[PDB]
Ligand binder design. Structure first.
Ligand code: HEM
Ligand SMILES: CCCCCCCCCCCCCCCC(=O)NCC(=O)O
Length: 457
């Protein structure tokens, strides 16, 4: 047994005020650098322990001892995501039921079926950039969000957000971002119901209505449609769980739609933005990735098999996920009393937070050069020790859309690298914006076309 390190306190508020920053994860990473593999974080009537080492996180990932917990951030997101897959407890009937009903939507057969629609949106991104004038630059995260939101909309719901037809935000995105920002900001509130937050509450309810009005539109579009679809929404509306034999009810379907539109694009936009950022900051790595894209993507538009062949692009994405996993943490609770790492006693119900970016910087696993961007670390994924690399979470509660995200991002990054040479024209200083999720803010580049014709579709 050992005393646990803990950061600075603010009297009766304990550690709570440390979350009074617009960059909490980054603040927690700095605390982990100072305190080590584990530290306690107290708030009035609440406590959790932040883990940063693979040695302790591998134990936390033992599902016989710990189950997914809804962190305070997820409890706030649940106000609009309900018992959708991301914010449901493992023991709630609707978690396994929806998991069984929707898993087929991420099968290899399904991925092959989404490919053409991913190409449709990727072609729109490449055409936008080909059409820019000499003077112009690209707002990277903004365009990656256009791409990822449209891709989940089309592949998952046969709905076109038509984001490339807009210069300003879709009300959905504005409301989604503001809702996630509010959840993050509520983390530091000692008195959530003080009147000074009435405006925040009013705005939060307004943003939730906007998201629900969009769900209404997607559902109306499907009912009134003639096109026969067999996508995510088809399974949500018609699929039956093999175990219970039951389909989802209307309320849960609405929560899944909101969940998938948000989880199904926000983090992929972050991944693509960080990958491009690292590529322009590491010229030799960008050269290797571009060479592979040119060599592999020999047709007017990429085939599904060709995307699977973009090995180095895939390594680039994994190395971007290592340094800046866009869902930066996940939470666990102890199923029963147990001892963590042979020295930290936990009582049944105690919470743990896995700080993924810190796990990914564990020098005892990766070597000392953890801050370097080296895709080659992922040349042979099998040599990576179990539970050392966890950008998609753990076990039965791991990311259900992992393959969708990586196929979309590999396809798009491959096409980007094939069609343009990129320039960090402002020598951009990394600024990571936090809204629970992480993404570069203000990242801009110039893309000079290689003038390679694009195929139809
Ligand atoms: C590279 C982009 C992505 C990253 C880094 C990511 C990361 C994660 C992580 C860390 C979790 C576990 C959360 C926890 O334990 O609290 C998770 C869960 C989940 N993700 Fe992803 N994700 C990504 C893309 C996607 C996409 C594109 C979709 C939709 C197709 C998606 C849908 C989900 C859902 C529905 C869950 C909840 C699964 C369950 O518990 O049943 N994710 N993701
Ligand atoms: C409905 C799908 C929603 C997808 C959004 C995913 C975001 C999940 C982010 C995980 C939490 C980020 C951590 C924020 C900082 C922190 O340590 N908070 C402590 C806490 O929330 O208890």
């Amino acid at each position: 047994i050992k005393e646990m390190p803990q950061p600075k306190t603010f009297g009766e508020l304990k550690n709570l005020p440390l979350l009074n920053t617009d960059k909490p994860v980054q603040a927690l990473m700095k605390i982990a650098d100072e305190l080590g593999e584990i530290f306690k974080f107290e708030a009035p009537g609440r406590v959790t322990r932040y883990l940063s080492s693979q040695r302790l996180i591998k134990e936390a990932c033992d599902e016989s001892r710990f189950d997914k917990n809804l962190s305070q951030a997820l409890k706030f997101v649940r106000d609009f995501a309900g018992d959708g897959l991301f914010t449901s407890w493992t023991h709630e009937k609707n978690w396994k039921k929806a998991h069984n009903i929707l898993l087929p939507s991420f099968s290899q057969q399904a991925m092959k079926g989404y490919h053409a629609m991913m190409v449709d949106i990727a072609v729109q991104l490449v055409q936008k950039w080909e059409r820019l004038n000499a003077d112009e630059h690209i707002e990277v995260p903004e365009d990656m969000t256009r791409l990822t939101l449209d891709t989940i909309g089309l592949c998952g719901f046969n709905y076109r957000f038509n984001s490339f037809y807009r210069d300003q935000p879709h009300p959905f995105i504005t409301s989604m971002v503001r809702a996630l920002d509010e959840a993050m900001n509520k983390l530091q509130r000692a008195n959530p119901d003080d009147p000074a937050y009435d405006e925040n509450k009013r705005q939060f309810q307004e943003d939730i209505k906007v998201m629900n009005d969009l769900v209404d539109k997607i559902i109306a579009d499907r009912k009134a449609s003639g096109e026969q679809s067999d996508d995510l929404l088809t399974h949500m509306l018609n699929g039956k769980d093999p175990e219970t034999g039951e389909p989802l009810d209307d309320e849960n379907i609405r929560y899944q739609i909101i969940t998938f539109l948000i989880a199904g694009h926000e983090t992929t936009s972050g991944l693509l933005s960080f990958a491009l950022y690292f590529l322009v900051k590491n010229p030799h790595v960008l050269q290797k990735a571009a060479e592979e894209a040119a060599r592999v993507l020999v047709d007017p538009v990429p085939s599904y098999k060709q995307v699977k062949q973009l090995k180095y692009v895939g390594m680039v994405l994994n190395e971007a996920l290592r340094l800046w996993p866009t869902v930066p943490a996940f939470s666990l609770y102890a199923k029963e009393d147990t001892v963590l790492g042979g020295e930290y006693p936990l009582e049944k119900g105690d919470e743990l937070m896995v700080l993924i970016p810190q796990l990914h910087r564990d020098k005892t696993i990766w070597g000392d050069d953890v801050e370097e961007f080296r895709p080659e670390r992922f040349e042979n994924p099998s040599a990576i020790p179990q539970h050392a690399f966890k950008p998609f979470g753990n076990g039965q509660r791991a990311c259900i859309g992992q393959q969708f995200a990586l196929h979309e991002a590999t396809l798009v990054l491959g096409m980007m690298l094939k069609h343009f040479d990129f320039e960090d024209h402002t020598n951009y200083e990394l600024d990571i914006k936090e809204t629970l999720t992480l993404k570069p803010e203000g990242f801009v580049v110039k893309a000079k076309s290689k003038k390679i014709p694009l195929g139809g579709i």
